[PDB]
Amino acid sequence: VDMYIERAGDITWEKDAEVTTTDGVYRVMTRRLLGSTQVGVGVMQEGVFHTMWHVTKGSALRSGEGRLDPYWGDVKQDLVSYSGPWKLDACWDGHSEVQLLAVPPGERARNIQTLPGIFKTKDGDIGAVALDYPAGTSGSPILDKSGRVIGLYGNGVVICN
């Protein structure tokens, strides 16, 4: 039994993308007996690891030889930061295309340019990436044209003001 993170690539906006403990994007992996599972994805920015609460459930993560303890979490927002407070502040303008840096289980990271739908929720309107990825892709970062993370896959995108 071992929960660990594994670099899958850099976070950048890609110009010609397909259309429908260093910083970067990581798979969250779990080893239990003879099995190996991708349980999710997250973002290392300014030495803080960001993912969704349901991916880790606050469990400590191995990175390399080191160990990352949960710093901050909210089950309601379904978010968790490791080694530091939440660092992702960018919001979606509500009209611009975004890029999903999808990291599906057993597959390479790839950017996919897409237009979020607006979804009516309890709290109000939020953006959502309407794309189907297999279980364990959740936490994949959503990027604005400036390469800043505007949300995590499964968790939606907040619209500004």
Next chain:
Amino acid sequence: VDMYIERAGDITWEKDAEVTGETTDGVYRVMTRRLLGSTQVGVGVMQEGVFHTMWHVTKGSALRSGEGRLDPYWGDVKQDLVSYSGPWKLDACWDGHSEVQLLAVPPGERARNIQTLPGIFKTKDGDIGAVALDYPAGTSGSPILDKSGRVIGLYGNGVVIC
């Protein structure tokens, strides 16, 4: 509490298996409710009014079942087990040579039985059976069955040898 259980089917050995709300007994998805939808975090077993799953699935957190909150009764983080609303009821063990059936309940897919022979895995305390099959995240807790349909362990937790 954002976690709830949902019956996925009956626990039985299937003859024609591939080879390699309800308070009733059976196999359940463990779901979390987010703003944009529900996510399957695990699977468990309702036997004799007690819900069994793995500690890492719920973290001891209360579940919504049917129209009633289930409170954790027993748990061990080390063995990675938790029973709800009563003590642990699953006592059956693996003989160490017989094939078993994994009643896999993968996220967004129907329950299916697959017949397989566990490998023997070395732990600190000794030898245990381990199902060598790859299922997506959220399939952990899926019951492993002897020919009598009794649960001999949960997927990702291995199978105690008698």
